[PDB]
């Protein structure tokens, strides 16, 4: 709410050192925590780690891979054929391919409604500090 | 429509002027008779060999080899276009 409460300190010479500033580490920790907190409550895409039959998208005569795969659906006992386009950086060979990180980690889908636009955040010292 | 490469423009004259300023400020630290050269990133993962954007909800990895390159000797409607690869 209030305006920035900036108080000039006349005749004060302070020794600064950015490379040992703990504010940097605190910002890094806070930002990673917000990232995890925002990513946590949405899709987990564990079923997506399947064998993908992928071909080139081509120019119709002769970057992107047109991939197809058998995915799960609402019902446990039903499966559906899904056609999609992936980038070549997301897809690695086992023609048959898989996603890049399916042998390493579970990829969590970014929640559709959350935007990654940065917003200004101010860090304020607690009472007794400045 | 047609399949086209994601790409990024930086003004050539402005970038050359910026590199001139940076070279002057570096020559202040290394000496006034030295040669200051720029080159693309020498290795690593895609996050470090390219410039990473997260804009519009989409992630770009742009080849910054066009911004760097060239050597500075001690002595415009022209844009540098950087190919950008997108990763989901």
């Amino acid at each position, epitope marked *: 709410d209030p305006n920035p409460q900036e108080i000039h300190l006349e005749n004060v010479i302070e020794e600064f050192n950015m490379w040992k500033n703990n504010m940097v580490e605190q910002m890094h920790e806070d930002i990673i925590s917000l990232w995890d907190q925002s990513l946590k409550p949405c899709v987990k895409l564990t079923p997506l780690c399947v064998t993908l039959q992928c071909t080139n998208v081509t*120019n*119709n*005569i002769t970057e992107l891979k047109n991939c197809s795969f058998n995915m799960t659906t609402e019902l446990r006992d039903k499966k559906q054929k899904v056609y999609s386009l992936f980038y070549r950086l997301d897809v690695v060979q086992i023609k048959e391919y898989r996603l890049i990180n399916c042998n390493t980690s579970a990829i969590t889908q970014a929640c559709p409604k959350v935007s990654f636009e940065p917003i200004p955040i101010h860090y304020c010292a607690p009472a007794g500090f400045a | 429509g*047609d*399949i*086209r490469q994601a*790409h990024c423009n930086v003004s050539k004259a402005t970038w050359n002027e910026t590199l001139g300023k940076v070279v002057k400020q570096l020559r202040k630290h290394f000496g006034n008779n030295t040669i200051i050269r720029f080159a693309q990133s020498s290795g690593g993962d895609l996050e470090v060999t390219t410039h990473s954007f997260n804009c519009g909800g989409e992630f770009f990895y742009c080849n910054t080899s066009g911004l760097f390159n060239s050597t500075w000797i001690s002595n415009s409607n022209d844009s540098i*276009t950087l190919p950008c690869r997108i990763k989901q």
Partner: antibody, heavy 127, light 106 residues
């Protein structure tokens, strides 16, 4: 667009034979690859070469050593010089435009050829 | 470098399939020209977009492997002519022209 082609017509063996082609009524000639083609009588078309306004030029291998193209850009005048011509190297010669479509950023190589859509009527040359 | 039949013969109601094959055709587009004796070639089939779409109702073509077939329906006596396939190499350094297939009308 009109491609008016001309030359000496009759030349002897072993000197340089020169051809000229005037481009008329083309808006923005710099976006097309200007090409030369030849055809001996009774034989198939033989591609000679082409040139672009940016300075890039290309030739047919095993003939490129005897051939060179110029293109005056102030007045769009499209010239060919072919040295060491032999008696058997005769027939019709045609100047033509390989129109180029751009669909993205030309600096990234995002274009393609529309083929040799406009051709000049050419000249029959005997050596 | 670019092989096509020397000639083909077709009746007025028949569709001619003029084939053209070569290694560089496995990756590059093919441009089809028609030539009459004396007259210069005229462009018949070209590339109007990165991702191909429909073309004129006549003079179509189909690609398969290293061979492209020019399908020409509704052939009449005026279409007797030498058909040429043209294509860039795999490095886009030079152009290849075919030997020409003389389409005749029975």
């Amino acid at each position: 667009v009109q491609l008016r082609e001309s030359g000496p017509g009759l030349v002897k063996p072993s000197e340089t034979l020169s051809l000229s082609c005037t481009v008329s009524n083309d808006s923005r000639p710099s976006d097309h690859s200007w090409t030369w083609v030849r055809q001996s009588p009774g034989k198939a078309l033989e591609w000679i070469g082409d040139i672009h306004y940016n300075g890039a030029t290309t030739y047919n291998p095993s003939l490129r050593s005897r051939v060179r193209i110029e293109l005056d850009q102030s007045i769009p005048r499209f010239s060919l010089k072919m040295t060491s011509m032999t008696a058997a190297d005769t027939g019709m010669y045609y100047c033509a435009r390989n129109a180029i479509r751009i669909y993205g950023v030309v600096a990234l190589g995002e274009w393609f050829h529309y083929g040799m859509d406009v051709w000049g009527q050419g000249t029959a040359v005997t050596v | 470098e670019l092989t096509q039949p020397p000639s083909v013969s077709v009746s007025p109601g028949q569709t001619a399939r003029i084939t053209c094959s070569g290694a560089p055709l496995t990756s590059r587009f093919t441009y089809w020209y028609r030539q009459k004796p004396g007259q210069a070639p005229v462009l018949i089939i070209s590339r109007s977009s990165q991702r191909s779409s429909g073309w004129s109702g006549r003079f179509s073509a189909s690609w398969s492997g290293t061979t492209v077939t020019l399908t020409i329906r509704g052939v009449q006596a005026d279409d007797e002519a030498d058909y040429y396939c043209q294509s860039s190499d795999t490095s886009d350094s030079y152009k290849m022209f075919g030997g020409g297939t003389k389409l005749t009308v029975l």
